[PDB]
Q: What sequence folds into this?
């Protein structure tokens, strides 16, 4: 198609089969289809643990630096990948979400202790 | 921890649609209950 | 080729449609009219968001304030209730030009210009004011101008340089050793060149879009 | 209060004015509005100048309305606004002048301080202190207490009306409070400082009874709560001032009454506008009442209270100082007339040149 307006973006293009996802990190005009015309492939992401228990990310850090220097935006999933790698700082919501998960497990642990205490009362009743 | 004055500034801005204020999160990841 | 032929109707349509737009431009009194019972704009039927309902009934528009002043309040200071609540430091506009909508039966719609002072820092040139049709404006009294505009700047405490990300820092130190540069200096990012304005900072009204004149 | 010389219209009536038939000029403006074309400021000026009868005022009132709702509303001239008030007084149409002044947003009549004194003084001499009070409230809404002469006349009307009005509604307290405060701030005399404490007291009443938004909404007043704190500061300032300044006893009684009343009372626009950390004004009244008694004791100990009523003190102030102001104001009035005369000639000359060029344009076309 002949797009009018838009910007270059670095995003994840979904590949693979059903229940077997695989991503191609690509630089593409934002208005193009998710799996359609792209400008350059900048790496790949396999989100499924392999035989060694490792999720494998490949980053063309030379071309990624090139396209960020030319105005390429970043999708939110790609910012999370760049943060985990160490190439970017950790994303604000990666930190906030981890804090929410800590607060949510703290409640669950306290409830289990209370239930055990309630179960202890049942033991006292015999 | 945010300053006490700034927490009140948000309570005025979003008066009527607020949630319980959260304190500092646990220092480590709480061990998963099993 | 040469079998591609002119499209006179297409050319005529484009030009003709343009003329209607120029002549039938809507006015601020019509585009930004509001129905306060339903909080919905009659021209387009657009319903205002929920977080704005209280202020639409409780606050005034800019030219409602200025229509009551001689010379439409040239030289007066005007602030916004949103700024008053968000920022402790003085934020206001110094009005320089005001073009009301004469069609409006109360001269309560129009455009304005002024010099911005945001969070105590003053701009050097006058530009058009954005969000003039918002129910957020508060005229500052003349006797309170001196106390309102009094500001003493605090020494800036936001860091000027920060470390590099963990991986990007290691790649820099590795390049140093490869190139023969021997040093234990820590790579540092400089944040002065790229410091971000607040999200509520007034934007450029001149380059902003205007709604179309087709009623819904 | 003002002298006959202040209200004499020999100078205005002797102004050089062009003779244009109102009917002819009326047609020109009517055609312009039909064609959605801008009307000149000189055109509306010529109409107001050539008003010759009570009926003509009615037609001119319509055209001033049309001018306000036109592309050249901003260019209404000061002398045109002054002539309107002068013509209204000349033909007995004072009600019309006050109507347009109150409906300024519709007609665009924003008079200068000299014109305000002319209209306000007419009502004062006729004894219509209800219309005179309306003029004072309009001066307050426009924040136009700059000239000293206007301040003296305004304070006399306010205090004279307040004495008659034993009962004040919340709107009246707000309007009276603002008018006293703004007029008082300009004056540094005992009457001026008494009106500042009087104004803050009334506004403090509305703040603690109906909320702070009743005080500042649509008023030339600040939105920060604590008007009773501003009143008490006036007492603390006078008490500790090295110079000997006095506060009228009448005002002190008003503040005592306000503190007692507030202390022991018997669609979606419902917002808490004050931060939770800040103390509400209602909780601070116990401390406020202690400061008042302490300040009152110190003031009486230092003999800084004036037993004389505020209406009597204001009358003396007006008699002593108003004569001098009349001379200064009248001197400035003569200068304004000459400045207006020159500017009017420039507009007439510029109009003649463009019309001559218009003929050349048609000749070329
Ligand atoms: Mg926005």
A:
């Amino acid at each position: 198609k002949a797009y009018h307006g838009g910007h270059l973006t670095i995003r994840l293009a979904l590949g693979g089969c059903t229940n077997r996802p695989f991503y191609r990190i690509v630089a593409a005009h934002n208005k193009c289809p998710r799996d359609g015309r792209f400008v350059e492939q900048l790496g790949s992401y396999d989100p499924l643990p392999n035989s060694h228990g490792e999720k494998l990310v490949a980053l063309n850090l030379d071309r990624i630096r090139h396209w960020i220097g030319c105005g390429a935006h970043l999708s939110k999933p790609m910012e999370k990948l760049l943060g985990l790698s160490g190439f970017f700082p950790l994303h604000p919501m990666m930190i906030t979400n981890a804090e929410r998960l800590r607060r949510r497990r703290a409640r669950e642990v306290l409830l289990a202790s209370q239930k055990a205490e309630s179960e202890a009362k049942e033991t006292e009743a015999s | 921890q945010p300053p006490e004055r700034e927490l009140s500034r948000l309570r005025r801005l979003y008066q009527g649609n607020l949630l319980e204020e959260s304190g500092p999160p646990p220092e480590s990841m709480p061990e998963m209950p099993t | 080729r040469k079998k591609v032929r002119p499209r006179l109707i297409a050319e005529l349509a484009r030009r003709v449609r343009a003329l209607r737009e120029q002549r039938n431009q809507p006015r601020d009194s019509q585009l930004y009219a509001l129905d306060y019972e339903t909080l919905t704009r009659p021209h387009s039927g657009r319903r205002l968001p929920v977080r704005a309902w209280a202020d639409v009934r409780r606050e005034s528009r800019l030219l409602q304030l200025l229509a009551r002043l001689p010379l439409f309040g040239l030289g007066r200071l005007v602030t916004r209730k949103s700024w008053l609540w968000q920022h402790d430091e003085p934020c206001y506009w110094r009005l320089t030009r005001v073009r009301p909508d004469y069609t409006a039966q109360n001269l309560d719609h129009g455009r304005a210009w002024g010099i911005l002072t945001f969070k105590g820092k003053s701009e050097d040139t006058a530009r058009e004011i954005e969000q003039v049709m918002y129910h957020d404006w508060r005229l500052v009294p003349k006797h309170e101008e001196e106390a309102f505009t009094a500001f003493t700047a605090k020494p800036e405490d936001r860091l000027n340089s920060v470390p590099y990300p963990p991986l990007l820092r290691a790649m820099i130190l590795a390049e140093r050793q490869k190139n023969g540069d021997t040093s234990v200096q820590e790579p540092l990012l400089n944040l002065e060149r790229t410091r971000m304005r607040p999200w509520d900072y007034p934007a450029k009204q001149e380059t902003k879009g205007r709604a179309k004149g087709t009623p819904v | 209060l003002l002298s006959a010389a202040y209200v004499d219209s020999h100078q205005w009536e002797a102004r050089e004015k062009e003779e244009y038939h109102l009917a002819d000029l009326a047609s020109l403006m009517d055609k312009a509005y039909e064609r959605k074309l801008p009307v000149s400021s000189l055109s509306i000026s010529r109409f107001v100048d050539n008003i010759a009868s009570r009926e003509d005022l009615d037609s001119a009132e319509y055209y001033l309305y049309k001018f306000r709702h036109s592309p050249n509303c901003w260019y209404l001239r000061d002398w045109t606004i002054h002539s309107w008030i002068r013509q209204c007084l000349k033909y007995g149409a004072q009600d019309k002048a006050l109507y347009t002044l109150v409906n300024k947003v519709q007609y665009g009549i924003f008079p200068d301080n000299f014109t305000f004194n002319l209209l306000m003084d007419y009502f004062i001499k006729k004894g219509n202190y209800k219309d005179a009070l309306s003029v004072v409230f309009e001066i307050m809404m426009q924040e136009a207490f700059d000239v000293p002469s206007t301040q003296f006349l305004s304070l006399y009307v306010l205090y004279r009306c307040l004495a008659e009005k034993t009962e004040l509604t919340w709107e009246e307290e707000r309007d009276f409070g603002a008018s006293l405060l703004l007029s008082g701030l300009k004056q540094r005399n005992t009457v001026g400082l008494s009106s500042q404490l009087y104004g803050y007291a009334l506004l403090g009443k509305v703040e603690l009874q109906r909320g702070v938004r009743a005080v500042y909404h649509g008023m030339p007043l600040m939105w920060t709560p604590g008007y009773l704190d501003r009143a008490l500061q006036v007492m603390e300032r006078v008490a500790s001032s090295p110079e000997d300044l006095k506060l009228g006893r009448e005002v002190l009684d008003v503040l005592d009454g306000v503190l007692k009343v507030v202390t022991s009372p018997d669609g979606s626009a419902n917002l808490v506008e004050q931060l939770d950390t800040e103390e509400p004004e209602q909780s601070k009244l116990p401390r406020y009442l202690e400061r008042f008694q302490a300040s009152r004791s110190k003031l009486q100990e230092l003999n800084r209270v004036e037993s004389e009523s505020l209406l009597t003190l204001t009358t003396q102030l007006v008699k002593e100082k108003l004569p001098a102001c009349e001379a200064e104001d009248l001197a400035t009035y003569e200068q304004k007339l000459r400045e207006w005369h020159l500017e009017r000639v420039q507009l007439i000359q510029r109009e003649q040149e463009q019309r001559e060029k218009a003929k050349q344009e048609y000749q070329a076309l």
